[PDB]
């Protein structure tokens, strides 16, 4: 928001003064002759035709400038990031952020980690978007050097304290008269304010793939498009052998039931003997049910059960189990 | 504080303007409405008028108003007032000149110091709001629910970050001094007063001290006293004339501040929903209009905007991705749309042509 | 009458609670705003409040 | 039903039961105020009046 703001305009008995480019916006000055203006238990201020009366004027800026004004943007291009959680192997949460670059050389631990970069690329932005509190909208274009009339370019400026107003109020004044000091005036109200009743939908508030923005970068926040091409080194130490293992034998899966549903909504057993107890992971490179379990222990007999979902009606596939893929088709699975 | 008040009242003094009342139409009191400024949240007013207030002249007593009493300068009690809008205000507080108040929502100020014989008043046309409550339509601020930001003028009087200029004052006229002298015009000076007199040749239109009094016009009339002034500094205005004082650009502090303070709301009341699996029925029973949107989360939004206060309900359907909804300071949530097969896959072959109609509803039905 | 006004009166006392007044959004004022009570075709409001009256 | 229409769902004036649901739900006393906000139904009947 603009202000104005008036100077004592001027008066004698006869006569005039004149007017000047006072340097303000808008600012305008004019005389004004037989002025003949009384003052309160006064003399009128003249002996005749006063003559003299400029209205000298003035236009300045307004107070919450300082708390509130425009954030007027030219948005670029600019880069990607995200979070990420490892839980590897032997490994717990390691919650881990890195820039999408398919270059970025990234160790934690033993993970040399290495992103993407994403498949898709593209964000919902403009060049031409401006904010006031948390709110943010894409403004087409502030019109930045073009005074526009005061309607939305209110205050023409480039910073709070550039103090360059290339905007038009378009303040004119009116003769004072009646025998009354005054500047009878009149100018533009104020224009981006009046937008300021119609301000509309915040894009954040429609952003697609229902995600959200951040503030002061403009992260976008985790519109989950698109395929990363990692690439992570792993502890080849953390590896063992082959040989001295509980080894697998007896193979056989009991499809228990399944329902298609969200939740990993299907149990399904197997039924085993093994060589020797322990442990061996059960993965899943057929996420068709997408099992509940990824690794179990492998107790000798290891004949016990699992929990996945799929949406099928029924399956026919199979999947792996310590190092030994073992076929559980899959039943007729309700729905809800 | 007291120091920047003690700087608005050290060299600044009240004075009086022809305050277009509405008795008459127009008034002369130190009441005369100024600085008209309201622009809180709280929907409160800091202004100041022709004289001081609140504090007496040198800064002291908040109820003693030094008001330009006529010509000359007084500071009385503040005893009574009637602090009003269309509505009784709200009113907070003051600073000297300033005046800090709050009223409710309206349109015309209605208020003048209860002199006793005169309220002075001077009373001004102004449309008032209540600021919305953020995100919905209501008339009160909430006194609990949902907390926000909201903006005020800070009641502190303790600011120099504001200031305005006390300026250099002017010229004024006058008529009473000239006396008669038992045959003509007579000069009478109160002190210091160069009162500029002219009658019908020129007399010290420098004005005089002195009594002087000169035969040219034995009338009183054309003899034109003009007294002028700057013992305090105050700021010149379109409603004041030039001034012979173009001078004392004395910023002396505003005392408030618009700041963005915080204050709650209350959320909305939570609508009926109904997964009537393939859509689900959405109906609320409010007590204001808020928004609700419906932004698709998948390539889309195709959103919903309305402002409804009356016991209503809607029906809406979406695949699993979920999408997004808020009604009132209701934040958005968004739910997958499932549990909805509809459909046998094996029955008979009639029953599984109904299946192969409805396992989906259009890629079955192009398909087939 | 006076009978059942004494009813009243003979061992009731007045009190104040923290009314949520206008002027600063709350008082603890005896005068403290209660039994808003006003439903008559006249628009008639029989009300009581944290204090004897 | 919800206090939509049986806002009074009893038997008689004296029979006292009450099969309604204001849907009565408290909200947390706080800024060191005592109080007990809340939240109920409407006079749903009474909407319908």
């Known amino acids: 928001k603009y202000k104005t703001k008036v100077p004592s305009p001027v008066v004698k008995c006869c006569g005039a003064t004149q007017c000047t480019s006072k340097p303000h916006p808008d600012y305008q000055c004019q005389v004004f002759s037989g002025v003949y203006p009384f003052m309160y238990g006064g003399a009128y201020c003249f002996c005749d035709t006063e003559n003299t009366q400029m209205s000298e004027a003035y236009v300045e800026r307004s107070e919450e400038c300082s708390i509130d004004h425009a954030k007027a943007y030219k948005v670029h291009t600019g880069t990607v990031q995200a979070m990420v959680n490892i839980t590897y192997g032997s490994v717990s949460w390691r919650s881990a952020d890195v820039y999408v670059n398919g270059e970025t050389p990234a160790k934690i631990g033993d993970a040399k980690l290495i992103i993407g970069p994403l498949s898709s690329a593209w964000s919902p932005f403009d060049n031409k978007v401006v904010v006031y509190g948390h709110e943010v909208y894409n403004y087409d274009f502030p019109e930045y050097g073009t005074g526009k009339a005061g309607s939305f370019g209110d205050l023409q400026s480039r910073t709070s304290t550039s103090n360059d107003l290339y905007a038009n109020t378009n303040l004119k004044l009116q003769r004072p008269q009646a025998g009354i000091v005054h500047t009878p005036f009149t100018q533009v109200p104020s224009g981006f304010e009046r937008w300021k009743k119609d301000k509309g939908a915040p894009l954040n508030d429609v952003a697609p793939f229902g995600c959200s923005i951040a503030l002061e970068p403009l992260r976008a926040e985790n519109c989950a498009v698109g395929s990363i091409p990692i690439s992570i080194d792993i502890p080849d130490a953390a590896f063992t052998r082959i040989s001295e293992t509980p080894t697998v034998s007896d193979l056989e899966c009991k499809i228990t039931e399944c329902t298609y549903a969200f939740d990993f909504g299907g149990i399904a057993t197997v039924a085993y003997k093994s060589s020797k107890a322990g442990n061996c992971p059960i993965h899943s490179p057929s996420g068709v049910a997408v099992i509940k379990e990824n690794d179990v222990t492998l107790a000798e007999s290891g004949s016990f059960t699992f929990h996945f979902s799929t949406a099928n009606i029924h399956p026919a596939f199979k999947l792996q189990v310590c190092t030994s893929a073992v076929t559980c088709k899959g039943d007729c699975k309700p729905p809800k | ?368």
Not at chain 2, 150 to 171: F, I, S, W
Not at chain 2, 184 to 210: E, F, H, L, N, W
Not at chain 2, 290 to 300: A, E, I, K, M, N
């Open chain 2, 1 to 368: 504080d007291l120091d920047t008040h003690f700087t608005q009242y050290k060299l600044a003094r009240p004075y009086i303007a022809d305050c277009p009342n509405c008795g008459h139409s127009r008034c002369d009191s130190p009441i005369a409405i100024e600085e008209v400024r309201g622009d809180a949240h709280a929907g409160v007013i800091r202004i100041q008028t022709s004289a001081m207030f609140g504090l007496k002249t040198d800064g002291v007593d908040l109820a003693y108003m030094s008001f330009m009493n006529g010509k000359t300068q007084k500071s009385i009690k503040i005893d009574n007032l009637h602090v009003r809008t269309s509505a009784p205000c709200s009113l907070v507080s003051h600073h000297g000149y300033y005046i800090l108040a709050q009223c409710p929502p309206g349109d015309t100020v209605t208020v003048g110091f209860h002199d006793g014989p005169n309220r002075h008043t001077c009373t001004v046309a102004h449309k008032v709001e209540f600021r919305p409550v953020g995100r919905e339509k209501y008339r009160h601020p909430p006194e609990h629910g949902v907390e926000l930001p909201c903006n005020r003028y800070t009641h502190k009087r303790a600011d120099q970050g504001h200031y305005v200029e006390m300026h250099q004052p002017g010229l004024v006229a006058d008529h009473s001094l000239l006396s008669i002298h038992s045959a003509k015009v007579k000069i009478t000076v109160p002190s210091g007063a160069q009162v500029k007199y002219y009658c019908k040749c020129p007399d010290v239109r420098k004005g005089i001290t002195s009594s002087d009094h000169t035969t040219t016009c034995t009338d009183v009339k054309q003899c034109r006293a003009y007294l002028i002034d700057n013992k305090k500094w105050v700021y010149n205005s379109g409603r004041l004339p030039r001034g012979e004082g173009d001078t004392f650009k004395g910023k002396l502090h505003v005392p408030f501040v618009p700041v963005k303070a915080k204050c709650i709301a209350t959320l909305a009341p939570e609508p009926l929903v109904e997964h009537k699996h393939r859509t689900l029925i959405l109906h609320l029973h409010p007590d204001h209009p808020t928004l609700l949107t419906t932004r698709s989360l998948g390539s889309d939004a195709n959103p919903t905007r309305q402002w409804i206060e009356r016991p209503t309900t809607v029906n809406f359907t979406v695949t699993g991705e979920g999408l997004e909804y808020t009604w009132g300071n209701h934040p958005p949530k968004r739910v997958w749309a499932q549990e909805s097969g509809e459909g046998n896959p094996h029955g008979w072959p009639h029953e599984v042509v109904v299946y192969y109609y409805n396992r989906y509803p259009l890629t079955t039905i192009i398909g087939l």
